[PDB]
């Protein structure tokens, strides 16, 4: 019965992840022998596995896991470097789990660099699906999904803290919640896009609102056939993005102070 880790969640279970930076540079048998010979207590590798250049295994007993953190910088390999143990709390064996793992990310950062420009900050991050490089690479970075879009923005934040544009059309993407943060990450972002995408309810622009968009786009989206004339469009849209100046490529009449 219930005492310290039952099949009924919210128990004294608690799962972890050991991830060893630069593991696959050693014998799955050696490395695991040492990360023991120095461990206060014995343990039990749960679903060990490599990933690019790392090795990472889960644990259960919160006590076990934590006695490995003391194995940190203890083992000392061939070339004479120090093994490094990164211990982190987490979900059980490959729980549902979504997102992109460290590699792909530090890999996505590349498509962008070769995409973002410093002449005009034009991060023509357009149609990423149908795109070479990542093309053929299991690289299913789908910006519509919070996950990608997430990192996708973390990089803009982390590397480009002055972006002035962000062509992002066509990328079959609907809910605009996820990229809600951009307002903080992409301040100077003046222009933007969402063109030929998939946005029915203009009520989305309400989310990404905070962008003083001295220019925008928004056609191709269902958001089209759901309005009166090009006037209800402008008049609506124009709200969230007042100082708006251009749109979908056509001329947009002057502002209107008071």
243: exposed, middle or buried (C-beta count within 10 Å: 0-12, 13-18, 19+)? exposed
Domain boundary among 75, 97, 119: 97
Indicate the residue among 97, 114, 135 that finishes a domain. Answer: 97
Do 174 and 242 reside in the same domain of the chain? yes
Shared domain for 32 and 125, answered yes or no, is no
Residue 237 and residue 126 in one domain:
yes
Give the C-alpha separation, 168 to 124, whole Å. Answer: 7
Q: CA 76, CA 82: separation in Å to the nearest integer?
A: 5
Identify the CATH number of the domain in which residue 151 sits: 3.80.10.10
Residues 89 and 204 in one domain: no
Considering the domain architecture, whether residues 190 and 62 belong to the same structural domain is answered as: no
CA atoms of 187 and 254, how far apart (whole Å): 24
Do 83 and 107 sit in the same domain of this protein? no
Phi–psi pair at 74, nearest 5 degrees: -95, -55
CB-based contact 172:197 (threshold 8 Å): yes
The answer on 26 and 149 residing in a single domain is no
Print the domain residue range for 35.
1-97
Residues 6 or more apart from 162 whose CB is under 8 A from it?
Answer: 121, 187, 188
154 and 251 share a domain?
Answer: yes
Phi and psi at 178, nearest 5°, equal -30, -45
Looking at the structure, do residues 144 and 89 belong to the same domain, yes or no?
Answer: no
Domain boundary among 53, 76, 97: 97
Distance of CA 165 to the CA centre of its chain: 19
75 and 186 within one domain = no
Q: Within 10 Å of residue 256's Cβ, how many Cβ atoms? A: 7
CA distance 172 to 155: 21
Whether residues 61 and 126 fall in one domain: no
Specify whether 90 is located in the same domain as 105: no
Q: Could you give the CA distance from residue 174 to residue 119 in angstroms, rounded to a whole number?
A: 30
Beta-bridge partners for 50: 55
How many domains does one find in the chain? 2
CATH number assigned to the domain comprising residue 8: 3.30.70.330
DSSP secondary structure, 53-78, as one string: TEE--EE--HHHHHHHGGGTTT-B-S
* DSSP tag of 188: T
Experimental method: X-ray
Q: Is 17 helix (H, G, I), strand (E, B) or coil?
A: strand
Resolution (A): 3.8
């Amino acid at each position: 019965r219930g005492g310290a880790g039952t099949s009924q969640d919210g128990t004294s279970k608690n799962w972890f992840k050991i991830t060893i930076p630069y593991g696959r540079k050693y014998d799955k048998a050696w490395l695991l022998s040492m990360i023991q010979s120095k461990s206060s207590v014995p343990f039990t590798p749960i679903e060990f596995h490599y990933e690019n250049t790392r090795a990472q295994f889960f644990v259960e007993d919160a006590s076990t896991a934590s006695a490995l953190k003391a194995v940190n910088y203890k083992i000392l390999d061939r070339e004479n470097r120090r093994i490094s143990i990164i211990i982190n709390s987490s979900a059980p064996p490959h729980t549902i789990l979504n997102e992109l793992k460290p590699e792909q990310v530090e890999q996505l950062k590349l498509i962008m660099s070769k995409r973002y420009d410093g002449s005009q900050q034009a991060l023509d991050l357009k149609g990423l699906r149908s795109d070479p490089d990542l093309v053929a690479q299991n690289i299913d970075v789908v910006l519509n999904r919070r996950s990608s879009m997430a990192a996708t923005l973390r990089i803009i934040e982390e590397n480009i803290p002055e972006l002035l544009s962000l062509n992002l059309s066509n990328n079959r993407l609907y809910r605009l919640d996820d990229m809600s943060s951009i307002v903080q990450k992409a301040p100077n972002l003046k222009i933007l896009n969402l063109s030929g995408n998939e946005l029915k309810s203009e009520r989305e622009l309400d989310k990404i609102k905070g962008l003083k968009l001295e220019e925008l786009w928004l056609d191709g989206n269902s958001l089209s056939d759901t309005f009166r004339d090009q006037s209800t469009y402008i008049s609506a849209i124009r709200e969230r993005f007042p100082k708006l100046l251009r749109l979908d490529g056509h001329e947009l009449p002057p502002p209107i102070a008071f």
